[PDB]
């Protein structure tokens, strides 16, 4: 298995590579989901995520899009968006993913990898908002 520290990584650029790995057949664990960043404007990012949360089926709430509001679930769904979710291969690939916030007691003392292609040093300016802040705005637990 491979463990990735999502501290200071671009959400989309981390998710793309993680999904490619899941398809290739590696076990992946993202350990610091809340610390990932999203570039852009705070107000527009919050509005987009609030609208996503508000999406629902009028006829029955038990079937509408259950878009996430936690940091780990946000990362999980972002990765799921880049997989053939409607195919058995894609489902099996997505089943090989675990996302946690903070370093759980079972992962201390291990080698935490990093994605060079998705580090925040690439950005010209640090105009980004963290997934933790997005979750706090949405009203998630953490």
């Amino acid at each position: 298995m491979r463990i990735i520290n999502a501290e200071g990584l671009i959400l989309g650029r981390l998710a793309s590579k993680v999904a490619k790995m899941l398809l290739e057949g590696e076990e992946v664990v993202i350990v610091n989901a809340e610390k990932a960043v999203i570039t852009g404007n705070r107000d527009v990012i919050f509005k987009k995520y609030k609208q996503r949360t508000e999406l629902r089926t009028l006829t029955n709430p038990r079937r509408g899009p259950f878009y996430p509001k936690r940091s780990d679930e946000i990362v999980r769904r972002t990765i799921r968006g880049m997989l053939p979710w409607k195919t058995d291969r894609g489902r099996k690939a997505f089943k090989r993913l675990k996302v946690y916030v903070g370093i759980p007691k079972e992962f201390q003392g291990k080698e935490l990898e990093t994605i060079i292609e998705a580090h925040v040093s690439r950005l010209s300016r640090p105009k980004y908002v963290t997934v933790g802040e997005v979750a706090k705005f949405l009203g998630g637990k953490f």
Binding site: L23, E24, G25, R89, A93
Partner: protein
């Protein structure tokens, strides 16, 4: 004897060729290193133990992938499975 992973078939966006597979050898990450494997055999072991045999004929892309031609095409459950070169 080298180790590899099956990536996919040789395909367009909506067209698939069932006799050619894309293989990623373990520690080959360039055309220069992948070109040394042309002509070698690729073996895929079925769950029941049957062996399917192909040959490397060309390099694919520039990241070290290769093309393998199989007389009997792989079943598609080999996608993401692990094959053995020679």
């Amino acid at each position: 004897r080298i180790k590899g992973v099956v990536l996919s078939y040789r395909r367009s966006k909506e067209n698939q060729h069932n006799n050619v597979m894309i293989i990623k050898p373990l520690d080959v990450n360039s055309r220069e290193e992948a070109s040394k494997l042309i002509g070698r055999l690729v073996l895929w072991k079925s769950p029941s133990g049957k062996i399917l045999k192909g040959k490397i004929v060309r390099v694919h892309g520039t990241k070290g992938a290769v093309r393998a031609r199989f007389e009997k095409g792989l079943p598609g459950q080999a996608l993401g499975d692990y094959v053995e070169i020679v």
